[PDB]
């Protein structure tokens, strides 16, 4: 689970800066104790793009098989991840799994600061699809000379 360094821009100004490792867990079997399919987002094989905004942004990460979409909202003061979507193709059998969590308050951080959380974070997107983050340090909206803000933590 290698940590990727991602970035979203408004022409030249920094809109979103995100470092993290991301894993997708799909539950093949109806039995909750049965093994699951793991998929590591490989950062050297993943395209970051996304859309900046005064009150709402998104970091989208695309890879062969699908994507992970992190949507940010700033309430002011403070910003947070307000939505998470994912899409993942498995070759055999031949399934696309996907899911979106719509109304969440996640990694909420005082505006102008950065969020850090090296500890594994987790979110059920659908009933079978789960996303896990690790080694997270990110920041959105307010920036100062392309550096991480006054920092914060989770647990
Ligand atoms: C990513 O999120 C934005 C809203 O923040 C949305 O417009 C876009 O459709 C999403 N992308 C995907 C592929 O889910
Ligand atoms: Ir599903
Ligand atoms: Ir939190």
Give CA–CA dist 129/69, Å, rounded.
14
Q: Looking at the DSSP assignment, which residues form a beta bridge with residue 121? A: 133
Q: Cβ-count burial of 114 within 10 angstroms (0-12 exposed, 13-18 middle, 19+ buried)?
A: buried
Q: What six digits make up the tokens of 15?
A: 């809109």
Ligand 1 centroid, distance to 151 Cα (angstroms): 27
Domain range summary for the chain, segments of one domain joined by + = 1-155
Give CA–CA dist 124/138, Å, rounded.
21
For residue 60, the ligand 1 atom closest to its alpha carbon is 1
Q: What six digits make up the tokens of 30?
A: 């109806």
26 within 8 A of 97, measured Cβ to Cβ: yes
Which one of 60, 63, 86 would you pick to mutate in the ligand 1 pocket, going by the greatest count of ligand atoms within 8 A of its CB? Answer: 60
Give CA–CA dist 154/117, Å, rounded.
6
Sorted by sequence, the CB contacts under 8 Å of residue 68 that are 6+ apart come out as: 22, 24, 41, 60, 61, 84, 85, 86, 131
130 within 8 A of 124, measured Cβ to Cβ: yes
86 within 8 A of 102, measured Cβ to Cβ: no
55 within 8 A of 45, measured Cβ to Cβ: no
Stated in angstroms to one decimal place, the resolution of this structure is 2.7
Which one of 57, 67, 69, 89 would you pick to mutate in the ligand 1 pocket, going by the greatest count of ligand atoms within 8 A of its CB? Answer: 69
Class of domain 1-155: mainly beta
115 within 8 A of 152, measured Cβ to Cβ: yes
96 within 8 A of 66, measured Cβ to Cβ: yes
């Amino acid at each position: 689970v290698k940590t990727g360094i991602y970035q979203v821009l408004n022409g030249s100004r920094l809109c979103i800066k995100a470092e993290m490792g991301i894993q997708l867990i799909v539950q093949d079997k109806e039995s909750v104790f049965s093994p699951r399919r793991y998929f590591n987002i490989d950062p050297n094989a993943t395209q970051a793009s996304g859309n900046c905004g005064t009150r709402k942004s998104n970091l989208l990460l695309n890879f062969q098989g699908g994507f992970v979409n992190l949507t940010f909202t700033k309430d002011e003061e403070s910003y947070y991840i307000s939505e998470v979507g994912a899409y993942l193709t498995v070759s055999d059998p031949e399934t696309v799994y996907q899911g979106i969590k719509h109304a969440v308050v996640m990694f909420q951080t005082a505006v102008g600061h950065s969020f850090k959380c090296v500890s594994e974070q987790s979110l059920q997107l659908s009933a079978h699809l789960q996303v896990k983050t690790t080694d997270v340090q990110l920041q959105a909206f307010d920036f100062e000379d392309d550096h991480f803000g006054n920092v914060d933590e989770c647990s």
